[PDB]
Amino acid sequence: PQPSRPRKGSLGFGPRKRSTSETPRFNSWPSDDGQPGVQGFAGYKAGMTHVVLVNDEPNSPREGMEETVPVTVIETPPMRAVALRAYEDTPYGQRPLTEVWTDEFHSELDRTLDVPEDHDPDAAEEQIRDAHEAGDLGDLRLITHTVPDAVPSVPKKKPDVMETRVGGGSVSDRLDHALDIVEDGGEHAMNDIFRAGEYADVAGVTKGKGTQGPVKRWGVQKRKGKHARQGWRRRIGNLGPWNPSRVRSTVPQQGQTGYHQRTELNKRLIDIGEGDEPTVDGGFVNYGEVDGPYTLVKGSVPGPDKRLVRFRPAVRPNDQPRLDPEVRYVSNESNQG
Amino acid sequence: MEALGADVTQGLEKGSLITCADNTGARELKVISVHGYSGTKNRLPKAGLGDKITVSVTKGTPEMRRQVLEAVVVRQRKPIRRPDGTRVKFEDNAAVIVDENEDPRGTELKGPIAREVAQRFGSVASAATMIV
Amino acid sequence: RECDYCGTDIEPGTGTMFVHKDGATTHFCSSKCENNADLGREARNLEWTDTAR
RNA sequence: CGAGUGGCUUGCUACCUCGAUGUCGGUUCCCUCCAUCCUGCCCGUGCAGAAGCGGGCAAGGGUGAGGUUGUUCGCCUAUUAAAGGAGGUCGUGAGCUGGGUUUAGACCGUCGUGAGACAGGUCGGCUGCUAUCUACUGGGUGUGUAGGUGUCUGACAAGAACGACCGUAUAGUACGAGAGGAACUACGGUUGGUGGCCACUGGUGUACCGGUUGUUCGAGAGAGCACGUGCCGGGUAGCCACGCCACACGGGGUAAGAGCUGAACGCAUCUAAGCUCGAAACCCACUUGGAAAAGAGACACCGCCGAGGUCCCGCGUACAAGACGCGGUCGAUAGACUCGGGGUGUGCGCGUCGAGGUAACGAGACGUUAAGCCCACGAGCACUAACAGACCAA
RNA sequence: GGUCUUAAGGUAGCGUAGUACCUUGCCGCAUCAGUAGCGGCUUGCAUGAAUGGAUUAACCAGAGCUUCACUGUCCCAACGUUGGGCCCGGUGAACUGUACAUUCCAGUGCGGAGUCUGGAGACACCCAGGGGGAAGCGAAGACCCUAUGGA
RNA sequence: GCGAAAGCCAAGGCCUGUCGGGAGCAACCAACGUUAGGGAAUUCGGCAAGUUAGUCCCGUACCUUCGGAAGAAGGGAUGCC
RNA sequence: GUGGAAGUCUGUUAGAGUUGGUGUCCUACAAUACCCUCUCGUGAUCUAUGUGUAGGGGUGAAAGGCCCAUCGAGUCCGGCA
Ligand SMILES: [Cl-]
Ligand SMILES: [Cl-]
Ligand SMILES: [K+]
Ligand SMILES: [Mg+2]
Ligand SMILES: [Mg+2]
Ligand SMILES: [Mg+2]
Ligand SMILES: [Mg+2]
Ligand SMILES: [Mg+2]
Ligand SMILES: [Mg+2]
Ligand SMILES: [Mg+2]
Ligand SMILES: [Mg+2]
Ligand SMILES: [Mg+2]
Ligand SMILES: [Mg+2]
Ligand SMILES: [Mg+2]
Ligand SMILES: [Mg+2]
Ligand SMILES: [Mg+2]
Ligand SMILES: [Mg+2]
Ligand SMILES: [Mg+2]
Ligand SMILES: [Mg+2]
Ligand SMILES: [Mg+2]
Ligand SMILES: [Mg+2]
Ligand SMILES: [Mg+2]
Ligand SMILES: [Mg+2]
Ligand SMILES: [Mg+2]
Ligand SMILES: [Mg+2]
Ligand SMILES: [Mg+2]
Ligand SMILES: [Mg+2]
Ligand code: NA
Ligand code: NA
Ligand code: NA
Ligand code: NA
Ligand code: NA
Ligand code: NA
Ligand code: NA
Ligand code: NA
Ligand code: NA
Ligand code: NA
Ligand code: NA
Ligand code: NA
Ligand code: NA
Ligand code: NA
Ligand code: NA
Ligand code: NA
Ligand code: NA
Ligand SMILES: [Sr+2]
Ligand SMILES: [Sr+2]
Ligand SMILES: [Sr+2]
Ligand SMILES: [Sr+2]
Ligand SMILES: [Sr+2]
Ligand SMILES: [Sr+2]
Ligand SMILES: [Sr+2]
Ligand SMILES: [Sr+2]
Ligand SMILES: [Sr+2]
Ligand SMILES: [Sr+2]
Ligand SMILES: [Sr+2]
Ligand SMILES: [Sr+2]
Ligand SMILES: [Sr+2]
Ligand SMILES: [Sr+2]
Ligand SMILES: [Sr+2]
Ligand SMILES: [Sr+2]
Ligand SMILES: [Sr+2]
Ligand SMILES: [Sr+2]
Ligand SMILES: [Sr+2]
Ligand SMILES: [Sr+2]
Ligand SMILES: [Sr+2]
Ligand SMILES: [Sr+2]
Ligand SMILES: [Sr+2]
Ligand SMILES: [Sr+2]
Ligand SMILES: [Sr+2]
Ligand SMILES: [Sr+2]
Ligand SMILES: [Sr+2]
Ligand SMILES: [Sr+2]
Ligand SMILES: [Sr+2]
Ligand SMILES: [Sr+2]
Ligand SMILES: [Sr+2]
Ligand SMILES: [Sr+2]
Ligand SMILES: [Sr+2]
Ligand SMILES: [Sr+2]
Ligand SMILES: [Sr+2]
Ligand SMILES: [Sr+2]
Ligand SMILES: [Sr+2]
Ligand SMILES: [Sr+2]
């Protein structure tokens, strides 16, 4: 009677093409509540290890017991909020109004941008504040970049640039909060934004697999039994009915799989430290050794080792925060074996 | 059902033949269905440690033979994961016949039982000689 | 914990426990050890083993 | 008894097609319909409760596994929230199958004088093609907007990104003589679906290490062949699922429905104007794409004798071409080497022992030896190679 | 019915059969569940004695059914191997072609339209792909009927 | 080795079952290796694949035209010195 | 015990054949091919050459099979435009 069955794969992540920017671009930000603050940070994926944790959950039958938890190690060195961009509200949505830059720039920021030699920070600030008085000011965001140089395992020296929204108290207060950071040199850290135990949304460009067929790319069945020996093994039944006389874009077909941007929600931060406590013996495979600012994210993170990953305070957390989980053990056992 | 306390990779399907670890007179049991389960197109219904299943008696005494009874999976060859990460696996696949109240039909259980199964079915546990 | 087969310590959050028919229990640190055991080899006769060493 | 709607059944007609539009059932894969089987929200009851029974809104999601039979249908079994029905050339053979139907062989029953027939049964019996256009999935090159780098906007577009269930507390409580026996809410888990990841478990791993059979290189050592590993055991990286991680709450507007105020109609009236509420459904929230959005966008800085870019060179977080990303001495980008980290399992040689044997000889054992051999990983290290150098450019 | 047509009126056996329409007959076996299979019953639509009946050890690339063993047939797919596929040098066909042709949704039309109508969408070119459509290509339909056709 | 069997190797013949170069070399296809747990649930039907296997010893049912059934079945052994 | 019969068994010995894969191929290597599986293999056996039977006629352990890629009546030319 032709049993029902959900379709193969989701239609919500298309088209399934190669990502335009290897640097992830958040398409949404946390709501304004607490004091002003940068709503995101970034780092480079190193690898995974596991840790034994004291069950934190107050509703768990195991509260207070040993629990082994998988962890992805991400190197999160200090970044530079190099500029403050203001958006104005218009009939056609938000549009960049102006930017307030700084004087101090990392020695190699010139590998990506044409660093400013002559700029007027006060004229920029002036225009912005006037926009606020006028009541045409849209959110406030900081132009941010990483310092790959601080990460030995990562070959690149060319910084990765991304814009990160600033939310918080009143606009006037966070506008001033924003200007404060920038001016210094923009240097800030993972600590300044996140605390172990909070939930973060991690975004990243997945591992690339080039061209793959329907079975692997969409999860369609392989031909079965006798149907697997006639000359068709990994090809779908048909491209559609007689009518409509065309192939709908919804039928599972071959193509690019991997290297797509993905935003994974509610990833618990198990620990934010610095040094080489998480490093594995022999070194993380295909990566290297960790000995500096790092973050331990519960579970998996999209992307291959060395790819830039971005953090953002969870915009739709399911559970309440249980700060600073107790870590009783961090495996440093070789990952080769 | 009440959380099991461990992750299970179902090692059994509908039609699987397993050991009846008790003294009811049933020696071999065939899995017919899995309580509370619902699969998907073409998927053979699966069962593992802790699941209550409907069974048919394949081997045993004439009186027990062919009767369709309820049972509880107590052991399986496919590994399971405990909170501390360790995997646990048994020498065989076995289940215990149980009544409408989940009380063992037999008087004695044969062989070890997973602690997790014991937590779920206490009366079954209070019949176990070995709980691992 | 130590591997009931080779003798080395079992990295926490690792290994498998095999529950014998009679209820006995054997904690294995790895597949390698499990597999040599399945072959009928006794840890003391295998030089690379802590037990042997 | 009367009035209709549908085009799922069947019949009718002969309008299209006989210089051919390949059958039924199944399968696989995609979209849809609602006359709703479940899930959400309601109304009534011959509604105490629990539960039935009937009705309304509602198509978001789900509707599964098996036994006979080619079967559709249907009968049957255990599960389930439920295991709804229908359209797409009775969707789907330039996709599959070939059981059935439907050639040529043969048999049975019936019919026929016979050849032979049967809208009966039965055994066997063939499935061509290198895609021109269009369509779509992904990937490039150009032109347009109109010197460069970086960052964005968001018209539009896609999503089910989430659906469902069990259990606990509520509570042996409300209700009820009892039997029986709820809910709001807060929790824990399972299942189906979805996206990603490999620390863990599992698979592979014709890298690698070991054992060993036959044969050839005289033996030994070390090797070839026995099919792309002779066979067997283990297994790194990597890739994987059987493994692991993540996938709301809340707003706004409504349907059925519950009501407020309220007249036409002094009263009454949920409705005529107005208003408070109210569905898994609608919009937003969330994810993904998206300056070719022709109103062809915004900001900042750099440059027009030079900003930037190309070729070139060393490479992969990338990859069928193309594209993409990183490094190039202001350097650790690749290789060598040495450590570290891994795999296998104790090398050659020699010495002792060794059932025996006059002796020769001798399978094998122990020691040397955590040995030997090996590594798609890491670090150190400029030793080798990223040199030399050509060119474009407002 | 307790003979009549047309001579006789089915005996031994076998029987729901490769013959039984009814039919998934009824009882039993076996299975969680068996339109199957086997045993029995049997009024046989329409079995039956060399149009041979019954039966049968041995034999069989003959048809159907059951069990033990085993397994990627399946749950549910993964990794690997060799040859292709992809890029480069050389060689170098064929099928097919009224014309135009970037289409999509509806409608209309000899009632099954890329070309008609109305809208919608649509910057050109190229690479790879699996084949939805061109009622795709290949063969003056083999089916059916017709011809004062053939064998 | 039972062997005019397999497999390996001589004498002898050949590199002409005659286009090459390149990409850890993707999808997809041909032919094939290895797959955890379940074990025919797949399918019209175990189709395909697999299981068993050589030799010796023990042992072998119904039925039978007394030939056979029969290698029934089932069990054990197997190298080297 | 001897003996060694058999349209006897196993057997890719030579040699003959072709159950299934509805595998590969299907502008083919090929107008009937390739691979694995499968059957026969002391006889009604297989095989070479010579020789005979001729078209409404042969030949046929019978399938309307075969008689030079064609046979429910060969091929060629003629009747014939
Ligand atoms: Cl299939
Ligand atoms: Cl079931
Ligand atoms: K026709
Ligand atoms: Mg590893
Ligand atoms: Mg390990
Ligand atoms: Mg199915
Ligand atoms: Mg007509
Ligand atoms: Mg056609
Ligand atoms: Mg309705
Ligand atoms: Mg009620
Ligand atoms: Mg829908
Ligand atoms: Mg059809
Ligand atoms: Mg078709
Ligand atoms: Mg066809
Ligand atoms: Mg074709
Ligand atoms: Mg048949
Ligand atoms: Mg005939
Ligand atoms: Mg047939
Ligand atoms: Mg019968
Ligand atoms: Mg007679
Ligand atoms: Mg004709
Ligand atoms: Mg005819
Ligand atoms: Mg005639
Ligand atoms: Mg397996
Ligand atoms: Mg089936
Ligand atoms: Mg077979
Ligand atoms: Mg002759
Ligand atoms: Na084929
Ligand atoms: Na078709
Ligand atoms: Na619905
Ligand atoms: Na059925
Ligand atoms: Na058709
Ligand atoms: Na079909
Ligand atoms: Na076909
Ligand atoms: Na078909
Ligand atoms: Na609402
Ligand atoms: Na007769
Ligand atoms: Na025969
Ligand atoms: Na396989
Ligand atoms: Na097509
Ligand atoms: Na040549
Ligand atoms: Na004699
Ligand atoms: Na054949
Ligand atoms: Na003639
Ligand atoms: Sr961004
Ligand atoms: Sr967006
Ligand atoms: Sr085929
Ligand atoms: Sr059409
Ligand atoms: Sr035609
Ligand atoms: Sr409706
Ligand atoms: Sr309901
Ligand atoms: Sr039909
Ligand atoms: Sr029927
Ligand atoms: Sr269909
Ligand atoms: Sr057939
Ligand atoms: Sr017939
Ligand atoms: Sr029939
Ligand atoms: Sr123009
Ligand atoms: Sr309850
Ligand atoms: Sr009671
Ligand atoms: Sr070889
Ligand atoms: Sr063997
Ligand atoms: Sr209303
Ligand atoms: Sr533009
Ligand atoms: Sr009679
Ligand atoms: Sr006979
Ligand atoms: Sr037009
Ligand atoms: Sr093609
Ligand atoms: Sr030679
Ligand atoms: Sr040549
Ligand atoms: Sr292997
Ligand atoms: Sr079967
Ligand atoms: Sr079946
Ligand atoms: Sr034997
Ligand atoms: Sr013979
Ligand atoms: Sr033979
Ligand atoms: Sr065939
Ligand atoms: Sr085959
Ligand atoms: Sr052919
Ligand atoms: Sr002989
Ligand atoms: Sr001929
Ligand atoms: Sr003529």
JSON list of N, CA and C in Angstrom, two decimals, chain B residues 86-115:
[
{"chain": "B", "resi": 86, "resn": "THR", "atom": "N", "xyz": [32.69, 3.61, 30.06]},
{"chain": "B", "resi": 86, "resn": "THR", "atom": "CA", "xyz": [33.02, 2.21, 29.84]},
{"chain": "B", "resi": 86, "resn": "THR", "atom": "C", "xyz": [31.92, 1.45, 29.10]},
{"chain": "B", "resi": 87, "resn": "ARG", "atom": "N", "xyz": [32.30, 0.53, 28.22]},
{"chain": "B", "resi": 87, "resn": "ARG", "atom": "CA", "xyz": [31.30, -0.26, 27.51]},
{"chain": "B", "resi": 87, "resn": "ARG", "atom": "C", "xyz": [31.16, -1.58, 28.28]},
{"chain": "B", "resi": 88, "resn": "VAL", "atom": "N", "xyz": [29.95, -2.14, 28.28]},
{"chain": "B", "resi": 88, "resn": "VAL", "atom": "CA", "xyz": [29.70, -3.39, 28.96]},
{"chain": "B", "resi": 88, "resn": "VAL", "atom": "C", "xyz": [29.02, -4.33, 27.98]},
{"chain": "B", "resi": 89, "resn": "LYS", "atom": "N", "xyz": [29.45, -5.59, 27.95]},
{"chain": "B", "resi": 89, "resn": "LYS", "atom": "CA", "xyz": [28.84, -6.56, 27.05]},
{"chain": "B", "resi": 89, "resn": "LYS", "atom": "C", "xyz": [28.81, -7.97, 27.66]},
{"chain": "B", "resi": 90, "resn": "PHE", "atom": "N", "xyz": [27.79, -8.74, 27.31]},
{"chain": "B", "resi": 90, "resn": "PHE", "atom": "CA", "xyz": [27.64, -10.09, 27.84]},
{"chain": "B", "resi": 90, "resn": "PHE", "atom": "C", "xyz": [28.01, -11.23, 26.89]},
{"chain": "B", "resi": 91, "resn": "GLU", "atom": "N", "xyz": [28.04, -12.43, 27.44]},
{"chain": "B", "resi": 91, "resn": "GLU", "atom": "CA", "xyz": [28.39, -13.63, 26.71]},
{"chain": "B", "resi": 91, "resn": "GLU", "atom": "C", "xyz": [27.27, -14.03, 25.75]},
{"chain": "B", "resi": 92, "resn": "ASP", "atom": "N", "xyz": [26.04, -13.67, 26.09]},
{"chain": "B", "resi": 92, "resn": "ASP", "atom": "CA", "xyz": [24.91, -14.04, 25.25]},
{"chain": "B", "resi": 92, "resn": "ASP", "atom": "C", "xyz": [23.77, -13.02, 25.29]},
{"chain": "B", "resi": 93, "resn": "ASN", "atom": "N", "xyz": [22.67, -13.37, 24.64]},
{"chain": "B", "resi": 93, "resn": "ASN", "atom": "CA", "xyz": [21.48, -12.53, 24.62]},
{"chain": "B", "resi": 93, "resn": "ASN", "atom": "C", "xyz": [20.45, -13.32, 25.42]},
{"chain": "B", "resi": 94, "resn": "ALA", "atom": "N", "xyz": [19.87, -12.68, 26.44]},
{"chain": "B", "resi": 94, "resn": "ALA", "atom": "CA", "xyz": [18.90, -13.36, 27.27]},
{"chain": "B", "resi": 94, "resn": "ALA", "atom": "C", "xyz": [17.84, -12.43, 27.77]},
{"chain": "B", "resi": 95, "resn": "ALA", "atom": "N", "xyz": [16.68, -13.02, 28.06]},
{"chain": "B", "resi": 95, "resn": "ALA", "atom": "CA", "xyz": [15.54, -12.29, 28.58]},
{"chain": "B", "resi": 95, "resn": "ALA", "atom": "C", "xyz": [14.84, -13.16, 29.62]},
{"chain": "B", "resi": 96, "resn": "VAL", "atom": "N", "xyz": [14.02, -12.52, 30.45]},
{"chain": "B", "resi": 96, "resn": "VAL", "atom": "CA", "xyz": [13.29, -13.19, 31.52]},
{"chain": "B", "resi": 96, "resn": "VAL", "atom": "C", "xyz": [11.79, -13.02, 31.32]},
{"chain": "B", "resi": 97, "resn": "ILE", "atom": "N", "xyz": [11.04, -14.12, 31.34]},
{"chain": "B", "resi": 97, "resn": "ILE", "atom": "CA", "xyz": [9.59, -14.02, 31.17]},
{"chain": "B", "resi": 97, "resn": "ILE", "atom": "C", "xyz": [9.00, -13.25, 32.34]},
{"chain": "B", "resi": 98, "resn": "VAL", "atom": "N", "xyz": [8.06, -12.37, 32.02]},
{"chain": "B", "resi": 98, "resn": "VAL", "atom": "CA", "xyz": [7.44, -11.50, 33.00]},
{"chain": "B", "resi": 98, "resn": "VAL", "atom": "C", "xyz": [5.91, -11.42, 32.83]},
{"chain": "B", "resi": 99, "resn": "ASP", "atom": "N", "xyz": [5.18, -11.21, 33.92]},
{"chain": "B", "resi": 99, "resn": "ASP", "atom": "CA", "xyz": [3.71, -11.13, 33.83]},
{"chain": "B", "resi": 99, "resn": "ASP", "atom": "C", "xyz": [3.20, -9.72, 33.57]},
{"chain": "B", "resi": 100, "resn": "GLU", "atom": "N", "xyz": [1.89, -9.54, 33.67]},
{"chain": "B", "resi": 100, "resn": "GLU", "atom": "CA", "xyz": [1.28, -8.24, 33.41]},
{"chain": "B", "resi": 100, "resn": "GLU", "atom": "C", "xyz": [1.73, -7.17, 34.40]},
{"chain": "B", "resi": 101, "resn": "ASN", "atom": "N", "xyz": [2.37, -7.58, 35.49]},
{"chain": "B", "resi": 101, "resn": "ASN", "atom": "CA", "xyz": [2.84, -6.64, 36.50]},
{"chain": "B", "resi": 101, "resn": "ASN", "atom": "C", "xyz": [4.36, -6.52, 36.49]},
{"chain": "B", "resi": 102, "resn": "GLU", "atom": "N", "xyz": [4.99, -7.19, 35.54]},
{"chain": "B", "resi": 102, "resn": "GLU", "atom": "CA", "xyz": [6.44, -7.16, 35.40]},
{"chain": "B", "resi": 102, "resn": "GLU", "atom": "C", "xyz": [7.14, -8.01, 36.45]},
{"chain": "B", "resi": 103, "resn": "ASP", "atom": "N", "xyz": [6.40, -8.90, 37.09]},
{"chain": "B", "resi": 103, "resn": "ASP", "atom": "CA", "xyz": [6.99, -9.79, 38.08]},
{"chain": "B", "resi": 103, "resn": "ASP", "atom": "C", "xyz": [7.46, -11.02, 37.31]},
{"chain": "B", "resi": 104, "resn": "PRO", "atom": "N", "xyz": [8.65, -11.53, 37.63]},
{"chain": "B", "resi": 104, "resn": "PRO", "atom": "CA", "xyz": [9.11, -12.72, 36.91]},
{"chain": "B", "resi": 104, "resn": "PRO", "atom": "C", "xyz": [8.16, -13.90, 37.08]},
{"chain": "B", "resi": 105, "resn": "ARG", "atom": "N", "xyz": [7.88, -14.59, 35.98]},
{"chain": "B", "resi": 105, "resn": "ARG", "atom": "CA", "xyz": [6.99, -15.74, 36.03]},
{"chain": "B", "resi": 105, "resn": "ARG", "atom": "C", "xyz": [7.69, -16.91, 36.72]},
{"chain": "B", "resi": 106, "resn": "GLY", "atom": "N", "xyz": [9.00, -16.99, 36.52]},
{"chain": "B", "resi": 106, "resn": "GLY", "atom": "CA", "xyz": [9.79, -18.04, 37.12]},
{"chain": "B", "resi": 106, "resn": "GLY", "atom": "C", "xyz": [10.13, -17.77, 38.58]},
{"chain": "B", "resi": 107, "resn": "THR", "atom": "N", "xyz": [10.89, -18.68, 39.17]},
{"chain": "B", "resi": 107, "resn": "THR", "atom": "CA", "xyz": [11.29, -18.57, 40.57]},
{"chain": "B", "resi": 107, "resn": "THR", "atom": "C", "xyz": [12.76, -18.21, 40.73]},
{"chain": "B", "resi": 108, "resn": "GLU", "atom": "N", "xyz": [13.57, -18.59, 39.74]},
{"chain": "B", "resi": 108, "resn": "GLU", "atom": "CA", "xyz": [14.99, -18.32, 39.79]},
{"chain": "B", "resi": 108, "resn": "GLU", "atom": "C", "xyz": [15.51, -17.80, 38.46]},
{"chain": "B", "resi": 109, "resn": "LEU", "atom": "N", "xyz": [16.45, -16.86, 38.51]},
{"chain": "B", "resi": 109, "resn": "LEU", "atom": "CA", "xyz": [17.04, -16.32, 37.30]},
{"chain": "B", "resi": 109, "resn": "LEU", "atom": "C", "xyz": [18.35, -17.04, 37.07]},
{"chain": "B", "resi": 110, "resn": "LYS", "atom": "N", "xyz": [18.74, -17.21, 35.81]},
{"chain": "B", "resi": 110, "resn": "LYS", "atom": "CA", "xyz": [19.98, -17.90, 35.50]},
{"chain": "B", "resi": 110, "resn": "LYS", "atom": "C", "xyz": [21.00, -16.98, 34.85]},
{"chain": "B", "resi": 111, "resn": "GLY", "atom": "N", "xyz": [22.17, -16.87, 35.46]},
{"chain": "B", "resi": 111, "resn": "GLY", "atom": "CA", "xyz": [23.20, -16.03, 34.90]},
{"chain": "B", "resi": 111, "resn": "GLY", "atom": "C", "xyz": [23.12, -14.62, 35.41]},
{"chain": "B", "resi": 112, "resn": "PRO", "atom": "N", "xyz": [24.10, -13.77, 35.08]},
{"chain": "B", "resi": 112, "resn": "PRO", "atom": "CA", "xyz": [24.12, -12.37, 35.52]},
{"chain": "B", "resi": 112, "resn": "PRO", "atom": "C", "xyz": [23.08, -11.50, 34.83]},
{"chain": "B", "resi": 113, "resn": "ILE", "atom": "N", "xyz": [22.85, -10.33, 35.41]},
{"chain": "B", "resi": 113, "resn": "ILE", "atom": "CA", "xyz": [21.89, -9.36, 34.89]},
{"chain": "B", "resi": 113, "resn": "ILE", "atom": "C", "xyz": [22.56, -8.00, 34.99]},
{"chain": "B", "resi": 114, "resn": "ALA", "atom": "N", "xyz": [22.24, -7.09, 34.08]},
{"chain": "B", "resi": 114, "resn": "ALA", "atom": "CA", "xyz": [22.82, -5.75, 34.12]},
{"chain": "B", "resi": 114, "resn": "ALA", "atom": "C", "xyz": [22.15, -4.97, 35.25]},
{"chain": "B", "resi": 115, "resn": "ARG", "atom": "N", "xyz": [22.94, -4.24, 36.03]},
{"chain": "B", "resi": 115, "resn": "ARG", "atom": "CA", "xyz": [22.42, -3.46, 37.15]},
{"chain": "B", "resi": 115, "resn": "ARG", "atom": "C", "xyz": [21.29, -2.56, 36.68]}
]
